[PDB]
Design a protein around this ligand. Structure first.
Ligand code: ADP
Lengths: 343, 343, 343
């Protein structure tokens, strides 16, 4: 009757995006964006959604569900695909929310980026940051480039994700992915060991934290490709905001190292298309022998002057004049209202 | 003799609004708005009201009762209903004050609002703030609209309350409520996870804090209905006061986003009626294609001009001329003495 | 079939720097800095790389691999040498990465370099850069020359390593080795103090960082032998790439200093031999009274013209025509395909 394994069964049979559990009702599934209860067999679930979720979570999580009130992880049913969970305490009762998790990475061209980006995958070392606010598909972007490298290069790529969003497959390069919580205790020692595990390209999952950044750099400056990601909105925001988490005693010193090992900043945002709702906008900065010196000498909005690689607003004008995004959706995601409408 | 469970017994038997404990007397109950001690059995309670309260509170509260001098939570006697507590140190001694939390939800019509409000519940996304000073029944209002959605729409509503005022019941939508203190550590991470728990409508319980607001927006502008609530008195106060908690570096940029994802502001206040004392007054602003542009260009009391959706004073004239509120109770709650009495 | 002992067998036979296991593929080995799967016998390894690594680790480690998600240790196969392991949890699965500890120091002749190199050890001061990609034995090279000086000269040598690869023994010279992490906080202050500790020969461990380079120079130009090492591939790459990490305000000024204190650049790579897999290829530039002026006046590929001390491709033709490396392994490691095959 009430076996998680079998509520997933009727979830992808009904062609589902999500499953949702709660105490007072029977198991629910989202189809299309409307929610229907498949009372079909699962009954109005007891207080013992407890037992159901508990059966998916490792020991490491069912501890963490007591410390805080929620956990965020990913498990696989070898039967179908892998999922992304989120168990949480509700009204003294347990409840979860399982998503579908992409099985194919998308090929790089369908993304809507130039090739001077794909070109970054050919570097020998440095930082490649892919910033952007949650649900801007930065993983989607990363996943692409990394895979491109997976096929193209004889490499040993290593990713320290939270959680593993895409599974990588087996080509020319050999790919270790380490989910946090599951397979390491923290981004901290997870990276720090990565640095000894003899890697080619390292993917520091998120750089929230001073110590992470620290080595993430120390790793890029030392023979490896370091793909980082963040939550800043523009290029010059990013490179402010990573230097802003240092003690300013030496703060300068990073700006310099950064203006040698910075190899690409790509801020992103996902928008509603005129068609099927799927279109991406971006700002793109790949440092050339010129831009380097600017950053060295702190002179930043002097780099904003020099962006024409390509500003954010600029990739909205080139997007709206082709009739893909509304004159009102893009005067919304755009940092500066001023730098367009003139266009 | 002195069992909490049994003091609640004689509390709803006597038909009570409140129970009150203190050290120097016996257990007290409010009936009607006068307080009588049911010395009936409970004796002049010792210093060990300690034991009585201690028996209701989770570990999480009896810690917090040491950090500060008080705690604010809610527990349930399945035997009758649920209650709202408030244990607090007094004169080196313990004391509490238990209310009855309600047991429906009122149907939206009994409230005294128009249906252009209830229409908000049909939006696809955005902010709907329901401001108003404590004991103006903003949870009451909320609870209504949310429940309206609970029945009408096939939805996954999530609320992050403090405390849970109304329990939601089980219809077309599936409803998680998360009491803070009890089920999460802070409005902060409680929301921040809600954003992952695949929600349709989110209810950020109060918007006191810069970081809360931040995501509350970021969630509205991204496909969800975000009900907020505050303590401001008029519409233009609200939309000043949320922008006023930002750093003005970018302050402008919120005003804009706000004039696209603002979908309704409803300030409220509760007044004494000529009959049973129960009548509500409100100010109502639902942005149309015109009002949008005003807020975009900072031009605010130009929206005050344009209010006739409907001003506060205005919903006092239409209230007193029908003979429900006194000429002196409403020149009291009204922001501006000027804009009436002329009427 | 799947015996660790025998995957090491085929690892040093093919002439390997590293072995790498993972779940979704067959055992991998790095040769030269490219990764190839010897599907030869070991099959697409199961989830039971578990069993393989488990067979190397003491009890003390297989405990620690549960506490954290990784462990870093060292075991010996008495059959060959000793290794450096790093087992770590990956995607719910085990994985490892074994390197190759020589703990001997090899006598300089077995290396396969001329004596005009060994002659550098007789200089009074300058930079001696030993560039080359990970697993090209640059420490092996270094260690040699340093030891040669250890026995030959009455000196105080000091190395700032990460980690200490070879232990130096006690002869005519007195040898301090400073492991980073263990015995100092950073290459930064570790060097910076080495400059006061009265040294004869200083070995700056890697030159990733603008400040390191700075002093590493300032030390060479002031009475000491400064052995540096990098990750560049050819000579002219090296001397671009260290000047490239300076601000170009003065950038010129290093090129000059460099064309006085540059004493030898030796780029390296390790290749699979026709016999036991152990053969090294190199490019060699020891500046004479002529080459100095060229670098002074920026004129670089004019030095490339003047290399015949000896080009990289050149040390592949003199290697393949003797029948030690394949016509296809060396048209792989070679920077330029053009400058050979004609030969
Ligand atoms: N029209 C009405 N019908 C029934 N109850 C009302 C009405 N107006 C006000 N009340 C009462 O006022 C009280 C305070 O409101 P409540 O929503 O609990 O607080 P808040 O102002 O903090 O949101 C409630 O107990 C509620 O029942």
């Amino acid at each position: 009757e009430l076996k998680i394994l079998e509520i997933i069964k009727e979830a992808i049979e009904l062609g589902a995006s999500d499953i949702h559990l709660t105490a007072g009702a029977p198991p629910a599934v989202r189809i299309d964006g409307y929610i229907k209860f498949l009372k079909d067999f699962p009954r109005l679930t007891p207080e013992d959604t407890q037992k159901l979720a508990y059966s998916v979570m490792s020991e490491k999580h069912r501890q963490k569900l007591e410390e805080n009130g929620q956990v965020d992880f990913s498990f696989g049913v070898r039967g179908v695909g892998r999922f992304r969970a989120n168990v949480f305490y509700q009204r003294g009762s347990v409840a979860a929310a399982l998503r579908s998790l992409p099985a194919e990475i998308p090929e790089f061209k369908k993304l809507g980026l130039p090739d001077k980006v794909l070109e970054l995958c050919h570097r020998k070392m440095g930082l490649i940051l892919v910033t952007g606010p949650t649900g801007s598909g930065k993983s989607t972007t990363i996943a692409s480039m990394i895979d491109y490298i997976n096929q193209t290069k004889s490499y040993h790529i290593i990713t320290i994700e939270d959680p593993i969003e895409y599974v990588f497959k087996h080509k020319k390069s050999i790919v270790n992915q380490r989910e946090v919580g599951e397979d390491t205790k923290s981004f901290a020692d997870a990276l720090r060991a990565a640095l000894r595990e003899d890697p080619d390209v390292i993917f520091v999952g998120e750089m929230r934290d001073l110590e992470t950044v620290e080595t993430a750099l120390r790793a890029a400056e030392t023979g490896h490709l370091v793909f980082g990601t963040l939550h800043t909105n523009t290029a010059i925001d990013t490179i402010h905001r990573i230097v802003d988490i240092f003690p300013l005693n030496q703060q300068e010193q990073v700006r310099i190292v950064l203006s040698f090992i910075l190899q690409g900043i790509i801020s992103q945002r996902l928008l509603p298309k005129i068609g099927g709702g799927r279109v991406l906008a971006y700002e793109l900065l790949i440092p050339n022998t010129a831009i380097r010196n600017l950053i060295r000498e702190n002179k930043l909005q002097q780099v904003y002057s020099l962006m024409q690689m390509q500003t954010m607003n600029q990739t909205l004008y080139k997007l709206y004049k082709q009739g893909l995004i509304t004159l009102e959706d893009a005067m919304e995601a755009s940092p500066d209202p001023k730098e367009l409408e003139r266009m």
